[PDB]
Design a protein around this motif. Structure first.
Motif, PDB file in Angstrom:
ATOM      1  N   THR D 160       0.829  -1.202   0.000  1.00  0.00           N
ATOM      2  CA  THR D 160       0.000   0.000   0.000  1.00  0.00           C
ATOM      3  C   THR D 160       0.857   1.243   0.000  1.00  0.00           C
ATOM      4  OG1 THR D 160      -0.428   0.487   2.436  1.00  0.00           O
ATOM      5  CG2 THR D 160      -1.804  -1.173   1.341  1.00  0.00           C
ATOM      6  N   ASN D 163       2.223   1.761  -3.520  1.00  0.00           N
ATOM      7  CA  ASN D 163       1.144   2.280  -4.373  1.00  0.00           C
ATOM      8  C   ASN D 163       1.052   3.804  -4.251  1.00  0.00           C
ATOM      9  OD1 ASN D 163       0.415  -0.382  -5.159  1.00  0.00           O
ATOM     10  ND2 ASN D 163      -1.325  -0.450  -3.758  1.00  0.00           N
ATOM     11  N   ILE D 164       1.109   4.320  -3.017  1.00  0.00           N
ATOM     12  CA  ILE D 164       1.099   5.807  -2.769  1.00  0.00           C
ATOM     13  C   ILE D 164       2.369   6.486  -3.321  1.00  0.00           C
ATOM     14  CG2 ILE D 164       1.077   7.568  -0.876  1.00  0.00           C
ATOM     15  CD1 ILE D 164      -0.886   5.950   0.596  1.00  0.00           C
ATOM     16  N   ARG D 167       1.800   6.534  -7.108  1.00  0.00           N
ATOM     17  CA  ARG D 167       0.744   7.426  -7.546  1.00  0.00           C
ATOM     18  C   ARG D 167       1.131   8.899  -7.383  1.00  0.00           C
ATOM     19  NH1 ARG D 167      -3.985   5.992  -8.925  1.00  0.00           N
ATOM     20  NH2 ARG D 167      -4.813   7.908  -7.948  1.00  0.00           N
ATOM     21  N   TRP D 168       1.820   9.228  -6.302  1.00  0.00           N
ATOM     22  CA  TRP D 168       2.120  10.606  -5.958  1.00  0.00           C
ATOM     23  C   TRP D 168       3.528  10.963  -6.448  1.00  0.00           C
ATOM     24  CZ3 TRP D 168      -1.926   8.526  -3.359  1.00  0.00           C
ATOM     25  CH2 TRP D 168      -2.919   9.386  -2.858  1.00  0.00           C
ATOM     26  N   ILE D 287      -4.757   2.144  -0.991  1.00  0.00           N
ATOM     27  CA  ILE D 287      -4.034   3.360  -0.570  1.00  0.00           C
ATOM     28  C   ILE D 287      -4.386   3.784   0.872  1.00  0.00           C
ATOM     29  CG2 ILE D 287      -3.593   4.436  -2.809  1.00  0.00           C
ATOM     30  CD1 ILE D 287      -6.154   6.109  -2.235  1.00  0.00           C
ATOM     31  N   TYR D 290      -3.397   7.006   2.998  1.00  0.00           N
ATOM     32  CA  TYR D 290      -3.942   8.324   2.720  1.00  0.00           C
ATOM     33  C   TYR D 290      -5.177   8.604   3.577  1.00  0.00           C
ATOM     34  CZ  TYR D 290      -4.973  12.357  -0.322  1.00  0.00           C
ATOM     35  OH  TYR D 290      -5.171  13.630  -0.857  1.00  0.00           O
ATOM     36  N   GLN D 322       3.566   7.240   2.729  1.00  0.00           N
ATOM     37  CA  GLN D 322       2.237   7.737   3.100  1.00  0.00           C
ATOM     38  C   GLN D 322       2.328   9.033   3.925  1.00  0.00           C
ATOM     39  OE1 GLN D 322       0.457   7.680   6.422  1.00  0.00           O
ATOM     40  NE2 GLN D 322       2.119   6.514   7.450  1.00  0.00           N
ATOM     41  N   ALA D 325       2.700  11.898   1.454  1.00  0.00           N
ATOM     42  CA  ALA D 325       1.515  12.125   0.564  1.00  0.00           C
ATOM     43  C   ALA D 325       0.443  12.916   1.356  1.00  0.00           C
ATOM     44  CB  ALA D 325       0.950  10.788   0.048  1.00  0.00           C
ATOM     45  N   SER D 378      -2.871   6.552   9.766  1.00  0.00           N
ATOM     46  CA  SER D 378      -3.412   5.677   8.703  1.00  0.00           C
ATOM     47  C   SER D 378      -3.829   4.341   9.312  1.00  0.00           C
ATOM     48  CB  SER D 378      -2.363   5.518   7.524  1.00  0.00           C
ATOM     49  OG  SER D 378      -1.110   4.768   7.756  1.00  0.00           O
TER      50      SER D 378
END
Lengths: 392, 392, 392, 392
Positions: D160, D163-164, D167-168, D287, D290, D322, D325, D378
């Motif tokens: 996870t 993935n962040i 993506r970011w 995610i 986030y 994370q 982000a 989180s």
């Protein structure tokens, strides 16, 4: 019948529990010793007729640990192999079995001995297959259950040693002095290079290069009688057996090339010793430590020897209490017993142990020019095995 | 050499996985068989010199399962015992071992055979002693690991059978037709009493009553070729090997009293058969099922015989692919092979199976007045064992 | 404060140990119940603000079992979820929690209740991560440890029941007669359809077909006092508590949609009942079964009510000894208590049980046109929870 | 409604995996923190209405870990207790639950927070109850399955975080520099005594006297950017998340006394901060890191604040990717975030973590005279919880 000879005799170093050999499977220790036994014997792998190896804690080691040691040693696949379990007897019994097979006329060259890695023994869930149903159950120490526990009396081999201490009146002090003497002799033997001829190094491939294990790590150098006297009984309240006067839980392989004298001559082998006689015997499980008395007496009878004719004796030291009871009853000259130390110092890798003391015996015989030799050791469940050797 | 004879030959019924013998430890199966073997030989427990038994899945069974069977059978403590692991060869190899020890001059009477309870095998945790540290691990099926998995190629015995189906071009149809005939012969044999002499009953005495087990439950009576053809492959996508043309996972003990001819005569015994020759051989682990080709050839040569001379043959059915390959290459008259059914019907209790087929062969020889007999089976890790019998 | 209402109330059938729900994880039971609860409230998944579920035996069920039930029920990812463990109080306490969060102004619609699958609980090895080093250990039944064992006195909940039978002088006969009446009432209720409204079916869809489970299987129809009197004590020598007068080990989920009265009105919902007051209390762990005395008294006081005002009462039957002690001290009219049977018949799926009795109480209130209702149960570790309902 | 205040806030030191607190059960860490929270708040144990504690790895800890922590702290048995599981959310969520319960009018004094001992997590056999039947199975790391593994996506929380990062576009370098900054700030905070007010010592009774644990051992003093850059990705080939830029596996308890302001005044308590608002939110599991974005924004809205009005922020650091982000999207002044270090340095004892950062926040607020504060973190399975504080 055919005469049977020892062509070579090799062992790994003996590691302590969870220490030097913890990452080396028994089968790998076996393969190492096999490769070197065959080299030292001066024969070819194709000359070998059968592989017969002791191993007690077989759980999860995979199909036929002896076959695995054979294959990993690079011996030909056409050679048959089998794994023998007589508890501590296993590594010695495979040699007299090799002798029997040769005397029977079915083979001329056998790889014999044994291997054990007690550090690597698993834990067991005995009812995981069909279910526990409900309730707490035992998570079983396989090393203890398969190696160290009487199946009939439901207690540790340690309690069998207390029973002999109580019956024979072998005191804590006496047990400690024998342990001290075993420690001192093993220190002197290691430091003087007595074991260099017989130890094959084990190479461990780690992250950074490799490391070699080639020295017996179990001995406690500079042991003292005061230090031994401070230890608490290990097996029962107010007992006499402690950690300091009993052997440990240890890892090793010990392997011998056994041959008929006729084949040895035909292949140019210079044998070390003749196997003169052998014998195994049973005793009450409750006093299993005394098994060697009866196995030794039978072996001596068959050979037409006396105990006083012996030059060197290896009588295993799983517990001081049992070694001392055997020693007392057979009237051993203790100056000729375990001259390089015994198992209290060196360790007791159960399925290899009987082969380990035979390897030690035959090398000591060669180095010291000692003509007549005995190897003997106790077996859980109430047995003993003994072998008599005469130097070539 | 002394002549070596089979005095008696007894087995329990063979139980199916998780079924009629699930609550009976291998060592208790063993003891029931021993006790009855001694009785049937017309000898006393005191006449036995040694106990040599096969057992493959020793994990957590405690010290020296053979010894435990001996003790529970009421045999004296003075009698030495040892446990042999040659995977499926174990129960047959104990018998040739016994012959070898008697030929060597060291015994006159030996309890041989094997025992297994696959239903009771544990699961293992290999790193519980020193710790996993982190992450999921394997909870290991000890039956698979120690009994059914090739240590060198990292696949099931079933893949070794597929290797042989592929290399020998043995079809799914050939395998199913062989399996059907084994089922047909087994049904007819049970119903006509062929196994009644050899089977000793097992009494299960729980908290509230008792249950006698005395019939082989693995056969599937009324098997059909259509039934067999429908089955899914057991070991690989599009495989030829199935649950229907391979044996099962089974529980049994089978025990024989082995003696010198001389001692049988001294004790008033009427022996069943003479052990004429024997042998073991190795082969590539990947095609272990063919081990019996080389082992049978060696034993036949030693006896001075030919395959055509044989009257009855017990060639084990671990998998139809391997039975078929062996039988094709040795050119067996299949009318003379597994006349009462084979392991596809009866089961394959690994440590006992080799002794099981020998027990079945000698009773079949006596009943059918058949002079020359052959028992052989395949061994995981690439081996085979064979024994040749001549009716007394 | 806002007024808080129950919009719907659904449960699965209660399965017996190792039986009809053994293959259905608690979180799937949970999801089936949620999905149907939302439907029966006449709302959409998007209308739910939070998911609060009880679950006691969380071991190895993965991160936040409540969240998993939510997700599998098709509820949006934006919805917060949490899992509560108050042992058997868990499923009832989630409901008073929901009321508290709505009263606090923070939500309008909450999924509450609980779920359990005791059949599926694991076994544990507590020292596998860092290692056992040596010796047998406990293979721990997680269901017993986390669900049924008192952490402070080191005995089973069953001993707490015996403590109460002893201190309150409640006889074996009293307990069996209570158990029989529960069985009688349960049979009559099932057969006359009392539970048909509240039970959502569970569809088990295996490899080859499907199986609908929609009936409570734990009741023993045709129970007799003679049958009950014959039973052995379950927890101690000469005990009064038995398998027949205590509940079982069971699998269930039970879920309620909880809303403000205002929101129910806005959404067109016809609520079943108003939550009037609630409370939890503690008591000596040794007599945990009496927790409901103190919890019920606190809730009654808060509501302004009396025990005599109550029309229907769900007082859980973990053990007849504790149900009887509570009922005697609160002076319940037993004609109004567990009118459809109690947990001795129906089962005691611990994390769900508190929600289960509330689901049963509100459907019984609607069917019997009963104005005032009480649900309460005991909690291991010495606690009780109670909720009071008033029919809309 | 009632105003809700923090009366005290205490934590144990945070231990590293298998290190300083390995021998101290979570419930014992909890009891220690509870005893000291109550002392520091200046109230009596009898003043406490409920105990509500976070704990994620509940497997084998016994009935209701919160109840056990309560009892062992010596709080009265009449006080109810419950254990809450929202993964990392748990320790923070118990405080907003405490606020909700007070605002609902049902309590005035709650013990809240959480406890975790990840070092002590067991391994699991999920099918030991009813049997594995045949085949190798998983020996399950409960810490991973229950704490660290996505139930929906079947991968680690670490994925996870990747993935962040993807993506970011948060790079390895950026992740490492944030980790370095967290390390340096934690070293400066420990050495300057920032945590002395908030840490309660843990006394461990060993063989020789006792030892005190009172300092956070996870930080790696003298960390460097070069050292961080050498680490390999921990979760996937060519990834960005390593051991150096993610938190560890850690042990701790953190406990707060939460009260209505009215009761606090009545008992003479000098509160630390007012709880202004709170909120939890869900996000896609994929995610989960986030989650704090949406929980924080909701909490800020409810309070009528802006992010720029905040004086101090604790935003947890389970993974740099994370944290970064969340930080980027909410536009945090990073000089006001985790001023004493975060979890990359200090550790991440999952069920305690949310309470741990709140304890850290409120003490930093008092010491630095910072009026407005946010705590947020989180949650695996795709959630976030946030709380806003204003100093008294």
């Amino acid at each position: 019948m055919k005469e049977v000879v020892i062509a070579s005799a090799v062992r790994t170093a003996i590691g302590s529990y969870g220490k030097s050999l913890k990452d080396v499977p028994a089968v790998d220790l076996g393969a190492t010793a096999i490769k070197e036994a065959v080299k030292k014997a001066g024969i070819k792998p194709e000359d070998v007729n059968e592989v017969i190896l002791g191993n007690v804690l077989q759980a999860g080691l995979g199909q036929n640990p002896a076959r695995q040691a054979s294959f990993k040693a690079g011996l030909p696949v056409e050679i048959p192999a089998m794994t023998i379990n007589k508890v501590c007897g296993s590594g010695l019994r495979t040699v007299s079995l090799a002798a029997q097979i040769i005397k029977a006329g079915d083979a001329d060259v056998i790889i014999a001995g044994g291997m054990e890695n007690m550090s690597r023994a698993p834990y067991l869930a005995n009812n995981a297959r069909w279910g526990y149903r409900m309730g707490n159950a035992k998570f079983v120490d396989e090393m203890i259950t398969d190696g160290l526990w009487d199946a009939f009396n439901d207690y540790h081999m340690g309690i069998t040693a207390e029973n002999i201490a109580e019956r024979w009146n072998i005191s804590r002090e006496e047990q400690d002095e024998f342990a001290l003497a075993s420690q001192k002799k093993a220190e002197e033997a290691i430091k003087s290079g007595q074991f260099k001829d017989e130890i094959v190094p084990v190479v461990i491939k780690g992250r950074k290069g490799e490391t070699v294990v080639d020295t017996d790590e179990h001995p406690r150098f500079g042991s003292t009688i005061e230090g031994l006297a401070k230890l608490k009984p290990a097996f029962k309240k107010d007992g006499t057996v402690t950690a300091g006067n009993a052997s440990g839980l240890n890892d090793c392989a010990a392997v011998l090339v056994i041959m008929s004298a006729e084949k040895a001559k035909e292949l140019g082998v210079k044998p070390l010793a003749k196997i003169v006689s052998y014998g195994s015997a049973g005793v009450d499980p409750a006093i299993m430590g005394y098994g060697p008395f009866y196995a030794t007496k039978a072996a001596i009878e068959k050979a037409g020897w006396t105990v006083d004719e012996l030059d060197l004796i290896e009588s295993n030291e799983a517990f001081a209490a049992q070694s001392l009871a055997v020693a007392k009853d057979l009237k051993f000259d203790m100056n000729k017993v375990n001259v390089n130390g015994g198992a209290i110092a060196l360790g007791h890798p159960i399925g290899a142990s009987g082969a380990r003391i035979l390897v030690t015996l035959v090398h000591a015989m060669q180095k010291r020019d000692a003509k007549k030799g005995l190897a003997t050791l106790s077996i859980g469940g109430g047995q003993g095995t003994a072998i008599l050797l005469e130097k070539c």
